[PDB]
């Protein structure tokens, strides 16, 4: 929701697969040189869910999720790194089929 999931960069070793997947808008480089403080990591859908949970009178659950958010984002950063580095092969799905 309102986030760039697929982007493109310099040409790929395998010519048919040129895409980079970034779940939650987070980058694998963020584990090395972050652009925000620890309290500042967020993305649109998760913050909207926290706001809705607070508006519904469920505050303890919202606090639990607010504490759990950095773990969630680090997990998705590791998944992004695995997808973009380890799994690059000729057996990957071509870009046009992925788009269709």
């Amino acid at each position: 929701w309102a986030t760039i999931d697929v982007e493109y960069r310099e040409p790929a070793p395998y010519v048919h697969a040129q895409r980079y997947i970034r779940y939650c808008g987070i980058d694998s480089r963020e584990l090395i040189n972050p652009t925000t403080y620890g309290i500042g990591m967020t993305y649109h859908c998760y913050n909207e869910m926290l706001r809705m949970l607070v508006a519904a009178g469920k505050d303890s659950e919202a606090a639990y999720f607010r504490s759990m958010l950095p773990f969630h984002m680090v997990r998705f950063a590791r998944i992004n790194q695995i997808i973009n580095e380890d799994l690059h092969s000729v057996f990957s799905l071509p870009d046009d089929m992925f788009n269709a």
Partner: protein, 100 residues
């Protein structure tokens, strides 16, 4: 005692943060987490335990650390003054018997 140990850690961070700019040929692979870990490895365990009382529940990254280091407040003591003078005296590494 707690404040003095924190001040000594801050001084060590401040002086070690410039080495990569001073020596690009040695620290080409370095990251700020490296000297953060190196300073943490040479600190008393009790101060780290006091900090871990809070940093096990909340998430911080190198931006928080760098903001903490650059803050001006320090607690004067004998060990702190001697540490600052020792860091000043080692400004030229011909005094540490290292050369290229």
């Amino acid at each position: 005692v707690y404040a003095s140990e924190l001040s000594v850690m801050k001084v060590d961070m401040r002086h070690l943060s410039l080495m990569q700019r001073r020596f690009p040929d040695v620290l080409i692979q370095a990251r700020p987490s490296h000297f953060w870990k190196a300073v943490l490895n040479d600190s008393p365990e009790a101060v780290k335990a006091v900090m871990n009382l809070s940093h096990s529940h909340n998430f911080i990254n190198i931006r928080d650390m760098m903001r903490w280091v650059m803050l001006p407040s320090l607690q004067p003591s004998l060990k702190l003054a001697l540490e600052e003078e020792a860091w000043a005296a080692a400004n030229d590494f011909e005094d540490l018997m290292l050369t290229d």
